[PDB]
Amino acid sequence: FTLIELMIVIAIVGILAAVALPAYQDYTARAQVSEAILLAEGQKSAVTEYYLN
Amino acid sequence: FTLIELMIVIAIVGILAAVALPAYQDYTARAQVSEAILLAEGQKSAVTEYYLN
């Protein structure tokens, strides 16, 4: 008898595929969301520039 | 498993290269555009000088 050793595999086979993937496509999103933010960084002072002058 | 840690790098690798570079070559331009303006500063009074006398 070994099957419970196979059972535990197929328990490992059914993986979670952690929410630490989709919370980190949401924070990979935070990466390229930031890529949008880093654009905004340029306009921060330029928009400001119009706003002040 | 770590790959999403590599994913997020290659999301950082693809950088924005912010428009705060080309809006600030346009305002680096404003620097040496100003370098043209600072020339004009001399002629402001000299052109004026002819204009008044």
PDB file of N, CA and C in Angstrom:
ATOM      1  N   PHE A   1       0.803  -1.237   0.000  1.00  0.00           N
ATOM      2  CA  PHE A   1       0.000   0.000   0.000  1.00  0.00           C
ATOM      3  C   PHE A   1       0.831   1.279   0.000  1.00  0.00           C
ATOM      4  N   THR A   2       0.530   2.150  -0.959  1.00  0.00           N
ATOM      5  CA  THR A   2       1.150   3.463  -1.049  1.00  0.00           C
ATOM      6  C   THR A   2       0.159   4.558  -1.413  1.00  0.00           C
ATOM      7  N   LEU A   3      -1.090   4.212  -1.740  1.00  0.00           N
ATOM      8  CA  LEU A   3      -1.980   5.120  -2.457  1.00  0.00           C
ATOM      9  C   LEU A   3      -2.155   6.442  -1.775  1.00  0.00           C
ATOM     10  N   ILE A   4      -2.136   6.446  -0.453  1.00  0.00           N
ATOM     11  CA  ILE A   4      -2.268   7.713   0.229  1.00  0.00           C
ATOM     12  C   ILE A   4      -1.113   8.628  -0.127  1.00  0.00           C
ATOM     13  N   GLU A   5       0.013   8.060  -0.550  1.00  0.00           N
ATOM     14  CA  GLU A   5       1.053   8.876  -1.132  1.00  0.00           C
ATOM     15  C   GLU A   5       0.653   9.422  -2.480  1.00  0.00           C
ATOM     16  N   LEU A   6      -0.199   8.722  -3.212  1.00  0.00           N
ATOM     17  CA  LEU A   6      -0.720   9.276  -4.452  1.00  0.00           C
ATOM     18  C   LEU A   6      -1.835  10.258  -4.179  1.00  0.00           C
ATOM     19  N   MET A   7      -2.651   9.953  -3.176  1.00  0.00           N
ATOM     20  CA  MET A   7      -3.697  10.867  -2.751  1.00  0.00           C
ATOM     21  C   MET A   7      -3.122  12.237  -2.464  1.00  0.00           C
ATOM     22  N   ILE A   8      -2.050  12.264  -1.684  1.00  0.00           N
ATOM     23  CA  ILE A   8      -1.526  13.535  -1.230  1.00  0.00           C
ATOM     24  C   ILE A   8      -0.933  14.297  -2.395  1.00  0.00           C
ATOM     25  N   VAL A   9      -0.446  13.589  -3.413  1.00  0.00           N
ATOM     26  CA  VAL A   9      -0.025  14.269  -4.630  1.00  0.00           C
ATOM     27  C   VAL A   9      -1.213  14.987  -5.224  1.00  0.00           C
ATOM     28  N   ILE A  10      -2.275  14.234  -5.504  1.00  0.00           N
ATOM     29  CA  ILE A  10      -3.428  14.805  -6.178  1.00  0.00           C
ATOM     30  C   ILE A  10      -4.114  15.850  -5.317  1.00  0.00           C
ATOM     31  N   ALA A  11      -3.799  15.876  -4.023  1.00  0.00           N
ATOM     32  CA  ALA A  11      -4.095  17.032  -3.200  1.00  0.00           C
ATOM     33  C   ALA A  11      -3.126  18.166  -3.470  1.00  0.00           C
ATOM     34  N   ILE A  12      -1.863  17.846  -3.764  1.00  0.00           N
ATOM     35  CA  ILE A  12      -0.928  18.881  -4.183  1.00  0.00           C
ATOM     36  C   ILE A  12      -1.208  19.266  -5.618  1.00  0.00           C
ATOM     37  N   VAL A  13      -1.724  18.344  -6.423  1.00  0.00           N
ATOM     38  CA  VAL A  13      -2.009  18.673  -7.813  1.00  0.00           C
ATOM     39  C   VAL A  13      -3.108  19.707  -7.872  1.00  0.00           C
ATOM     40  N   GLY A  14      -4.229  19.407  -7.231  1.00  0.00           N
ATOM     41  CA  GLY A  14      -5.198  20.449  -7.057  1.00  0.00           C
ATOM     42  C   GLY A  14      -4.481  21.446  -6.194  1.00  0.00           C
ATOM     43  N   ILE A  15      -3.984  22.498  -6.827  1.00  0.00           N
ATOM     44  CA  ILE A  15      -3.251  23.510  -6.100  1.00  0.00           C
ATOM     45  C   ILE A  15      -4.267  24.557  -5.741  1.00  0.00           C
ATOM     46  N   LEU A  16      -3.884  25.429  -4.840  1.00  0.00           N
ATOM     47  CA  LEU A  16      -4.689  26.608  -4.643  1.00  0.00           C
ATOM     48  C   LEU A  16      -4.672  27.474  -5.879  1.00  0.00           C
ATOM     49  N   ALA A  17      -3.491  27.660  -6.467  1.00  0.00           N
ATOM     50  CA  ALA A  17      -3.269  28.778  -7.365  1.00  0.00           C
ATOM     51  C   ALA A  17      -3.638  30.067  -6.639  1.00  0.00           C
ATOM     52  N   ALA A  18      -2.778  30.357  -5.665  1.00  0.00           N
ATOM     53  CA  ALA A  18      -3.011  31.321  -4.607  1.00  0.00           C
ATOM     54  C   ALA A  18      -3.665  32.575  -5.108  1.00  0.00           C
ATOM     55  N   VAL A  19      -4.528  33.137  -4.259  1.00  0.00           N
ATOM     56  CA  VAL A  19      -5.027  34.487  -4.463  1.00  0.00           C
ATOM     57  C   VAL A  19      -3.881  35.486  -4.501  1.00  0.00           C
ATOM     58  N   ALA A  20      -2.696  35.096  -4.017  1.00  0.00           N
ATOM     59  CA  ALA A  20      -1.480  35.858  -4.231  1.00  0.00           C
ATOM     60  C   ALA A  20      -1.034  35.859  -5.680  1.00  0.00           C
ATOM     61  N   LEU A  21      -1.759  35.249  -6.574  1.00  0.00           N
ATOM     62  CA  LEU A  21      -1.652  35.607  -7.969  1.00  0.00           C
ATOM     63  C   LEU A  21      -2.634  36.724  -8.348  1.00  0.00           C
ATOM     64  N   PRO A  22      -3.945  36.564  -8.124  1.00  0.00           N
ATOM     65  CA  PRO A  22      -4.868  37.626  -8.528  1.00  0.00           C
ATOM     66  C   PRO A  22      -4.890  38.841  -7.632  1.00  0.00           C
ATOM     67  N   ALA A  23      -4.500  38.710  -6.378  1.00  0.00           N
ATOM     68  CA  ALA A  23      -4.249  39.928  -5.622  1.00  0.00           C
ATOM     69  C   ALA A  23      -2.983  40.619  -6.093  1.00  0.00           C
ATOM     70  N   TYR A  24      -2.149  39.915  -6.848  1.00  0.00           N
ATOM     71  CA  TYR A  24      -0.931  40.460  -7.402  1.00  0.00           C
ATOM     72  C   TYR A  24      -0.946  40.507  -8.908  1.00  0.00           C
ATOM     73  N   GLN A  25      -2.059  40.146  -9.537  1.00  0.00           N
ATOM     74  CA  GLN A  25      -2.358  40.846 -10.766  1.00  0.00           C
ATOM     75  C   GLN A  25      -3.010  42.172 -10.428  1.00  0.00           C
ATOM     76  N   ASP A  26      -3.713  42.222  -9.290  1.00  0.00           N
ATOM     77  CA  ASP A  26      -4.215  43.489  -8.775  1.00  0.00           C
ATOM     78  C   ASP A  26      -3.092  44.373  -8.252  1.00  0.00           C
ATOM     79  N   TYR A  27      -1.960  43.793  -7.877  1.00  0.00           N
ATOM     80  CA  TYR A  27      -0.797  44.580  -7.516  1.00  0.00           C
ATOM     81  C   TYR A  27       0.285  44.549  -8.578  1.00  0.00           C
ATOM     82  N   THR A  28       0.230  43.594  -9.505  1.00  0.00           N
ATOM     83  CA  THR A  28       0.814  43.843 -10.811  1.00  0.00           C
ATOM     84  C   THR A  28       0.068  44.962 -11.476  1.00  0.00           C
ATOM     85  N   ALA A  29      -1.249  44.975 -11.310  1.00  0.00           N
ATOM     86  CA  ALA A  29      -1.997  46.136 -11.735  1.00  0.00           C
ATOM     87  C   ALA A  29      -1.454  47.356 -11.034  1.00  0.00           C
ATOM     88  N   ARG A  30      -1.204  47.260  -9.722  1.00  0.00           N
ATOM     89  CA  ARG A  30      -0.595  48.386  -9.032  1.00  0.00           C
ATOM     90  C   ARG A  30       0.732  48.761  -9.657  1.00  0.00           C
ATOM     91  N   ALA A  31       1.409  47.818 -10.306  1.00  0.00           N
ATOM     92  CA  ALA A  31       2.609  48.179 -11.043  1.00  0.00           C
ATOM     93  C   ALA A  31       2.268  49.055 -12.238  1.00  0.00           C
ATOM     94  N   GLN A  32       1.384  48.589 -13.114  1.00  0.00           N
ATOM     95  CA  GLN A  32       1.126  49.382 -14.301  1.00  0.00           C
ATOM     96  C   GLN A  32       0.053  50.428 -14.083  1.00  0.00           C
ATOM     97  N   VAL A  33      -0.799  50.244 -13.087  1.00  0.00           N
ATOM     98  CA  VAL A  33      -1.497  51.391 -12.530  1.00  0.00           C
ATOM     99  C   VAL A  33      -0.474  52.448 -12.146  1.00  0.00           C
ATOM    100  N   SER A  34       0.616  52.027 -11.497  1.00  0.00           N
ATOM    101  CA  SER A  34       1.662  52.991 -11.193  1.00  0.00           C
ATOM    102  C   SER A  34       2.280  53.533 -12.459  1.00  0.00           C
ATOM    103  N   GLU A  35       2.381  52.698 -13.488  1.00  0.00           N
ATOM    104  CA  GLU A  35       2.846  53.188 -14.776  1.00  0.00           C
ATOM    105  C   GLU A  35       1.948  54.309 -15.278  1.00  0.00           C
ATOM    106  N   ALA A  36       0.655  54.247 -14.970  1.00  0.00           N
ATOM    107  CA  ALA A  36      -0.193  55.400 -15.240  1.00  0.00           C
ATOM    108  C   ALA A  36       0.117  56.525 -14.276  1.00  0.00           C
ATOM    109  N   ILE A  37       0.446  56.179 -13.039  1.00  0.00           N
ATOM    110  CA  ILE A  37       0.735  57.204 -12.055  1.00  0.00           C
ATOM    111  C   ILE A  37       2.029  57.908 -12.408  1.00  0.00           C
ATOM    112  N   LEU A  38       3.010  57.154 -12.868  1.00  0.00           N
ATOM    113  CA  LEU A  38       4.268  57.773 -13.210  1.00  0.00           C
ATOM    114  C   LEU A  38       4.111  58.709 -14.390  1.00  0.00           C
ATOM    115  N   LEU A  39       3.127  58.467 -15.250  1.00  0.00           N
ATOM    116  CA  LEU A  39       2.796  59.482 -16.234  1.00  0.00           C
ATOM    117  C   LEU A  39       2.301  60.721 -15.530  1.00  0.00           C
ATOM    118  N   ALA A  40       1.308  60.530 -14.651  1.00  0.00           N
ATOM    119  CA  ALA A  40       0.698  61.616 -13.903  1.00  0.00           C
ATOM    120  C   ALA A  40       1.740  62.462 -13.205  1.00  0.00           C
ATOM    121  N   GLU A  41       2.827  61.828 -12.761  1.00  0.00           N
ATOM    122  CA  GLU A  41       3.927  62.531 -12.120  1.00  0.00           C
ATOM    123  C   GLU A  41       4.415  63.698 -12.960  1.00  0.00           C
ATOM    124  N   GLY A  42       4.498  63.512 -14.274  1.00  0.00           N
ATOM    125  CA  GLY A  42       4.909  64.611 -15.122  1.00  0.00           C
ATOM    126  C   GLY A  42       3.905  65.735 -15.102  1.00  0.00           C
ATOM    127  N   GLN A  43       2.630  65.389 -15.193  1.00  0.00           N
ATOM    128  CA  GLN A  43       1.610  66.410 -15.203  1.00  0.00           C
ATOM    129  C   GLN A  43       1.418  67.062 -13.849  1.00  0.00           C
ATOM    130  N   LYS A  44       1.896  66.438 -12.766  1.00  0.00           N
ATOM    131  CA  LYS A  44       1.732  67.011 -11.434  1.00  0.00           C
ATOM    132  C   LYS A  44       2.242  68.430 -11.399  1.00  0.00           C
ATOM    133  N   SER A  45       3.452  68.622 -11.898  1.00  0.00           N
ATOM    134  CA  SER A  45       4.048  69.940 -11.871  1.00  0.00           C
ATOM    135  C   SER A  45       3.564  70.786 -13.031  1.00  0.00           C
ATOM    136  N   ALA A  46       3.259  70.157 -14.156  1.00  0.00           N
ATOM    137  CA  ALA A  46       2.829  70.917 -15.315  1.00  0.00           C
ATOM    138  C   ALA A  46       1.415  71.438 -15.131  1.00  0.00           C
ATOM    139  N   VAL A  47       0.521  70.581 -14.656  1.00  0.00           N
ATOM    140  CA  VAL A  47      -0.811  71.032 -14.275  1.00  0.00           C
ATOM    141  C   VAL A  47      -0.692  72.095 -13.207  1.00  0.00           C
ATOM    142  N   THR A  48       0.137  71.812 -12.209  1.00  0.00           N
ATOM    143  CA  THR A  48       0.460  72.790 -11.191  1.00  0.00           C
ATOM    144  C   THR A  48       0.966  74.061 -11.829  1.00  0.00           C
ATOM    145  N   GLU A  49       1.793  73.913 -12.858  1.00  0.00           N
ATOM    146  CA  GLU A  49       2.416  75.071 -13.468  1.00  0.00           C
ATOM    147  C   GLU A  49       1.367  76.014 -14.022  1.00  0.00           C
ATOM    148  N   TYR A  50       0.371  75.465 -14.708  1.00  0.00           N
ATOM    149  CA  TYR A  50      -0.736  76.292 -15.149  1.00  0.00           C
ATOM    150  C   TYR A  50      -1.497  76.837 -13.959  1.00  0.00           C
ATOM    151  N   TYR A  51      -1.666  76.011 -12.931  1.00  0.00           N
ATOM    152  CA  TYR A  51      -2.516  76.391 -11.817  1.00  0.00           C
ATOM    153  C   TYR A  51      -1.924  77.559 -11.054  1.00  0.00           C
ATOM    154  N   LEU A  52      -0.603  77.650 -11.033  1.00  0.00           N
ATOM    155  CA  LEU A  52       0.071  78.660 -10.241  1.00  0.00           C
ATOM    156  C   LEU A  52       0.296  79.944 -11.008  1.00  0.00           C
ATOM    157  N   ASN A  53       0.519  79.838 -12.310  1.00  0.00           N
ATOM    158  CA  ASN A  53       0.817  80.983 -13.148  1.00  0.00           C
ATOM    159  C   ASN A  53      -0.362  81.430 -13.985  1.00  0.00           C
TER     160      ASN A  53
ATOM    161  N   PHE B   1       7.164  28.022  -5.725  1.00  0.00           N
ATOM    162  CA  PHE B   1       6.684  29.090  -6.621  1.00  0.00           C
ATOM    163  C   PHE B   1       7.097  30.494  -6.192  1.00  0.00           C
ATOM    164  N   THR B   2       7.705  31.216  -7.129  1.00  0.00           N
ATOM    165  CA  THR B   2       8.076  32.608  -6.926  1.00  0.00           C
ATOM    166  C   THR B   2       7.801  33.474  -8.146  1.00  0.00           C
ATOM    167  N   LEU B   3       7.400  32.884  -9.277  1.00  0.00           N
ATOM    168  CA  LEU B   3       7.481  33.555 -10.569  1.00  0.00           C
ATOM    169  C   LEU B   3       6.771  34.874 -10.599  1.00  0.00           C
ATOM    170  N   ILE B   4       5.678  34.987  -9.866  1.00  0.00           N
ATOM    171  CA  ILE B   4       4.994  36.260  -9.849  1.00  0.00           C
ATOM    172  C   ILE B   4       5.894  37.337  -9.277  1.00  0.00           C
ATOM    173  N   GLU B   5       6.884  36.950  -8.477  1.00  0.00           N
ATOM    174  CA  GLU B   5       7.914  37.891  -8.103  1.00  0.00           C
ATOM    175  C   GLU B   5       8.802  38.247  -9.270  1.00  0.00           C
ATOM    176  N   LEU B   6       8.970  37.348 -10.228  1.00  0.00           N
ATOM    177  CA  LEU B   6       9.702  37.698 -11.434  1.00  0.00           C
ATOM    178  C   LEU B   6       8.830  38.482 -12.387  1.00  0.00           C
ATOM    179  N   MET B   7       7.554  38.116 -12.448  1.00  0.00           N
ATOM    180  CA  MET B   7       6.595  38.856 -13.249  1.00  0.00           C
ATOM    181  C   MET B   7       6.625  40.326 -12.890  1.00  0.00           C
ATOM    182  N   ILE B   8       6.561  40.608 -11.597  1.00  0.00           N
ATOM    183  CA  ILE B   8       6.426  41.985 -11.169  1.00  0.00           C
ATOM    184  C   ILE B   8       7.700  42.746 -11.467  1.00  0.00           C
ATOM    185  N   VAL B   9       8.841  42.059 -11.485  1.00  0.00           N
ATOM    186  CA  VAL B   9      10.067  42.705 -11.935  1.00  0.00           C
ATOM    187  C   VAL B   9       9.888  43.147 -13.368  1.00  0.00           C
ATOM    188  N   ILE B  10       9.563  42.194 -14.240  1.00  0.00           N
ATOM    189  CA  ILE B  10       9.475  42.492 -15.659  1.00  0.00           C
ATOM    190  C   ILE B  10       8.345  43.461 -15.954  1.00  0.00           C
ATOM    191  N   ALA B  11       7.437  43.646 -14.999  1.00  0.00           N
ATOM    192  CA  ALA B  11       6.548  44.792 -15.018  1.00  0.00           C
ATOM    193  C   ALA B  11       7.268  46.058 -14.594  1.00  0.00           C
ATOM    194  N   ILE B  12       8.216  45.948 -13.661  1.00  0.00           N
ATOM    195  CA  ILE B  12       9.046  47.098 -13.327  1.00  0.00           C
ATOM    196  C   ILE B  12      10.079  47.311 -14.410  1.00  0.00           C
ATOM    197  N   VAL B  13      10.498  46.249 -15.089  1.00  0.00           N
ATOM    198  CA  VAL B  13      11.492  46.410 -16.141  1.00  0.00           C
ATOM    199  C   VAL B  13      10.905  47.220 -17.273  1.00  0.00           C
ATOM    200  N   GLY B  14       9.764  46.775 -17.782  1.00  0.00           N
ATOM    201  CA  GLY B  14       9.052  47.636 -18.681  1.00  0.00           C
ATOM    202  C   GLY B  14       8.693  48.811 -17.820  1.00  0.00           C
ATOM    203  N   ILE B  15       9.459  49.882 -17.962  1.00  0.00           N
ATOM    204  CA  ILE B  15       9.219  51.065 -17.165  1.00  0.00           C
ATOM    205  C   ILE B  15       8.327  51.935 -18.004  1.00  0.00           C
ATOM    206  N   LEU B  16       7.757  52.931 -17.371  1.00  0.00           N
ATOM    207  CA  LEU B  16       7.111  53.958 -18.150  1.00  0.00           C
ATOM    208  C   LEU B  16       8.125  54.711 -18.978  1.00  0.00           C
ATOM    209  N   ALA B  17       9.258  55.060 -18.368  1.00  0.00           N
ATOM    210  CA  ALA B  17      10.093  56.124 -18.894  1.00  0.00           C
ATOM    211  C   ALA B  17       9.242  57.379 -19.051  1.00  0.00           C
ATOM    212  N   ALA B  18       8.890  57.897 -17.876  1.00  0.00           N
ATOM    213  CA  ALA B  18       7.846  58.884 -17.679  1.00  0.00           C
ATOM    214  C   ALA B  18       7.864  59.955 -18.729  1.00  0.00           C
ATOM    215  N   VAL B  19       6.663  60.418 -19.080  1.00  0.00           N
ATOM    216  CA  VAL B  19       6.515  61.634 -19.863  1.00  0.00           C
ATOM    217  C   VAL B  19       7.143  62.818 -19.141  1.00  0.00           C
ATOM    218  N   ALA B  20       7.402  62.689 -17.835  1.00  0.00           N
ATOM    219  CA  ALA B  20       8.222  63.638 -17.107  1.00  0.00           C
ATOM    220  C   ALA B  20       9.676  63.604 -17.532  1.00  0.00           C
ATOM    221  N   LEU B  21      10.046  62.803 -18.490  1.00  0.00           N
ATOM    222  CA  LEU B  21      11.259  63.063 -19.230  1.00  0.00           C
ATOM    223  C   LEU B  21      11.000  63.950 -20.456  1.00  0.00           C
ATOM    224  N   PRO B  22      10.099  63.575 -21.373  1.00  0.00           N
ATOM    225  CA  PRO B  22       9.895  64.416 -22.553  1.00  0.00           C
ATOM    226  C   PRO B  22       9.093  65.675 -22.321  1.00  0.00           C
ATOM    227  N   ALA B  23       8.264  65.718 -21.294  1.00  0.00           N
ATOM    228  CA  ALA B  23       7.730  67.017 -20.915  1.00  0.00           C
ATOM    229  C   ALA B  23       8.795  67.885 -20.272  1.00  0.00           C
ATOM    230  N   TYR B  24       9.907  67.286 -19.865  1.00  0.00           N
ATOM    231  CA  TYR B  24      11.019  67.996 -19.279  1.00  0.00           C
ATOM    232  C   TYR B  24      12.268  67.919 -20.118  1.00  0.00           C
ATOM    233  N   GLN B  25      12.195  67.314 -21.299  1.00  0.00           N
ATOM    234  CA  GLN B  25      13.035  67.848 -22.347  1.00  0.00           C
ATOM    235  C   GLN B  25      12.351  69.057 -22.953  1.00  0.00           C
ATOM    236  N   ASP B  26      11.014  69.070 -22.919  1.00  0.00           N
ATOM    237  CA  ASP B  26      10.266  70.263 -23.295  1.00  0.00           C
ATOM    238  C   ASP B  26      10.416  71.373 -22.266  1.00  0.00           C
ATOM    239  N   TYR B  27      10.741  71.039 -21.024  1.00  0.00           N
ATOM    240  CA  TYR B  27      11.052  72.050 -20.032  1.00  0.00           C
ATOM    241  C   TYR B  27      12.534  72.130 -19.721  1.00  0.00           C
ATOM    242  N   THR B  28      13.310  71.109 -20.083  1.00  0.00           N
ATOM    243  CA  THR B  28      14.713  71.355 -20.365  1.00  0.00           C
ATOM    244  C   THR B  28      14.823  72.264 -21.553  1.00  0.00           C
ATOM    245  N   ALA B  29      13.962  72.053 -22.540  1.00  0.00           N
ATOM    246  CA  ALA B  29      13.869  73.022 -23.608  1.00  0.00           C
ATOM    247  C   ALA B  29      13.540  74.372 -23.021  1.00  0.00           C
ATOM    248  N   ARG B  30      12.584  74.427 -22.085  1.00  0.00           N
ATOM    249  CA  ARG B  30      12.303  75.697 -21.432  1.00  0.00           C
ATOM    250  C   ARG B  30      13.542  76.253 -20.761  1.00  0.00           C
ATOM    251  N   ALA B  31      14.487  75.400 -20.377  1.00  0.00           N
ATOM    252  CA  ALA B  31      15.748  75.911 -19.870  1.00  0.00           C
ATOM    253  C   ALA B  31      16.532  76.613 -20.968  1.00  0.00           C
ATOM    254  N   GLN B  32      16.792  75.927 -22.076  1.00  0.00           N
ATOM    255  CA  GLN B  32      17.618  76.564 -23.085  1.00  0.00           C
ATOM    256  C   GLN B  32      16.812  77.412 -24.046  1.00  0.00           C
ATOM    257  N   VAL B  33      15.518  77.158 -24.165  1.00  0.00           N
ATOM    258  CA  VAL B  33      14.633  78.200 -24.655  1.00  0.00           C
ATOM    259  C   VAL B  33      14.839  79.452 -23.816  1.00  0.00           C
ATOM    260  N   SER B  34      14.908  79.287 -22.492  1.00  0.00           N
ATOM    261  CA  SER B  34      15.196  80.446 -21.661  1.00  0.00           C
ATOM    262  C   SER B  34      16.575  80.988 -21.949  1.00  0.00           C
ATOM    263  N   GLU B  35      17.517  80.106 -22.264  1.00  0.00           N
ATOM    264  CA  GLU B  35      18.832  80.567 -22.680  1.00  0.00           C
ATOM    265  C   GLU B  35      18.721  81.464 -23.905  1.00  0.00           C
ATOM    266  N   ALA B  36      17.757  81.195 -24.780  1.00  0.00           N
ATOM    267  CA  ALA B  36      17.480  82.150 -25.844  1.00  0.00           C
ATOM    268  C   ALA B  36      16.807  83.386 -25.285  1.00  0.00           C
ATOM    269  N   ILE B  37      15.966  83.204 -24.278  1.00  0.00           N
ATOM    270  CA  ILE B  37      15.269  84.339 -23.706  1.00  0.00           C
ATOM    271  C   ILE B  37      16.250  85.235 -22.978  1.00  0.00           C
ATOM    272  N   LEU B  38      17.197  84.637 -22.280  1.00  0.00           N
ATOM    273  CA  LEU B  38      18.152  85.444 -21.559  1.00  0.00           C
ATOM    274  C   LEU B  38      19.021  86.239 -22.512  1.00  0.00           C
ATOM    275  N   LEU B  39      19.208  85.755 -23.736  1.00  0.00           N
ATOM    276  CA  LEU B  39      19.816  86.612 -24.738  1.00  0.00           C
ATOM    277  C   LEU B  39      18.913  87.793 -25.001  1.00  0.00           C
ATOM    278  N   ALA B  40      17.641  87.497 -25.297  1.00  0.00           N
ATOM    279  CA  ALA B  40      16.646  88.512 -25.598  1.00  0.00           C
ATOM    280  C   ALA B  40      16.606  89.584 -24.534  1.00  0.00           C
ATOM    281  N   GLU B  41      16.852  89.195 -23.281  1.00  0.00           N
ATOM    282  CA  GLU B  41      16.897  90.133 -22.171  1.00  0.00           C
ATOM    283  C   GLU B  41      17.829  91.299 -22.456  1.00  0.00           C
ATOM    284  N   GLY B  42      18.976  91.026 -23.067  1.00  0.00           N
ATOM    285  CA  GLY B  42      19.876  92.110 -23.406  1.00  0.00           C
ATOM    286  C   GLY B  42      19.270  93.032 -24.435  1.00  0.00           C
ATOM    287  N   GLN B  43      18.660  92.456 -25.456  1.00  0.00           N
ATOM    288  CA  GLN B  43      18.073  93.271 -26.494  1.00  0.00           C
ATOM    289  C   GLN B  43      16.815  93.984 -26.042  1.00  0.00           C
ATOM    290  N   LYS B  44      16.194  93.545 -24.940  1.00  0.00           N
ATOM    291  CA  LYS B  44      14.972  94.184 -24.463  1.00  0.00           C
ATOM    292  C   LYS B  44      15.175  95.670 -24.303  1.00  0.00           C
ATOM    293  N   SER B  45      16.250  96.036 -23.623  1.00  0.00           N
ATOM    294  CA  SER B  45      16.510  97.438 -23.379  1.00  0.00           C
ATOM    295  C   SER B  45      17.186  98.087 -24.568  1.00  0.00           C
ATOM    296  N   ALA B  46      17.981  97.327 -25.308  1.00  0.00           N
ATOM    297  CA  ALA B  46      18.687  97.901 -26.435  1.00  0.00           C
ATOM    298  C   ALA B  46      17.740  98.172 -27.592  1.00  0.00           C
ATOM    299  N   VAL B  47      16.881  97.208 -27.898  1.00  0.00           N
ATOM    300  CA  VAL B  47      15.818  97.440 -28.865  1.00  0.00           C
ATOM    301  C   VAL B  47      14.956  98.589 -28.394  1.00  0.00           C
ATOM    302  N   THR B  48      14.585  98.540 -27.120  1.00  0.00           N
ATOM    303  CA  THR B  48      13.880  99.638 -26.492  1.00  0.00           C
ATOM    304  C   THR B  48      14.649 100.925 -26.675  1.00  0.00           C
ATOM    305  N   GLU B  49      15.966 100.848 -26.530  1.00  0.00           N
ATOM    306  CA  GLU B  49      16.780 102.046 -26.578  1.00  0.00           C
ATOM    307  C   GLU B  49      16.636 102.738 -27.919  1.00  0.00           C
ATOM    308  N   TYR B  50      16.681 101.964 -28.998  1.00  0.00           N
ATOM    309  CA  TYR B  50      16.415 102.541 -30.303  1.00  0.00           C
ATOM    310  C   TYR B  50      14.986 103.032 -30.382  1.00  0.00           C
ATOM    311  N   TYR B  51      14.062 102.274 -29.802  1.00  0.00           N
ATOM    312  CA  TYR B  51      12.651 102.582 -29.964  1.00  0.00           C
ATOM    313  C   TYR B  51      12.301 103.894 -29.293  1.00  0.00           C
ATOM    314  N   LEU B  52      13.004 104.224 -28.220  1.00  0.00           N
ATOM    315  CA  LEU B  52      12.679 105.399 -27.436  1.00  0.00           C
ATOM    316  C   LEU B  52      13.401 106.637 -27.919  1.00  0.00           C
ATOM    317  N   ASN B  53      14.614 106.469 -28.424  1.00  0.00           N
ATOM    318  CA  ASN B  53      15.441 107.579 -28.860  1.00  0.00           C
ATOM    319  C   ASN B  53      15.478 107.738 -30.365  1.00  0.00           C
TER     320      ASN B  53
END
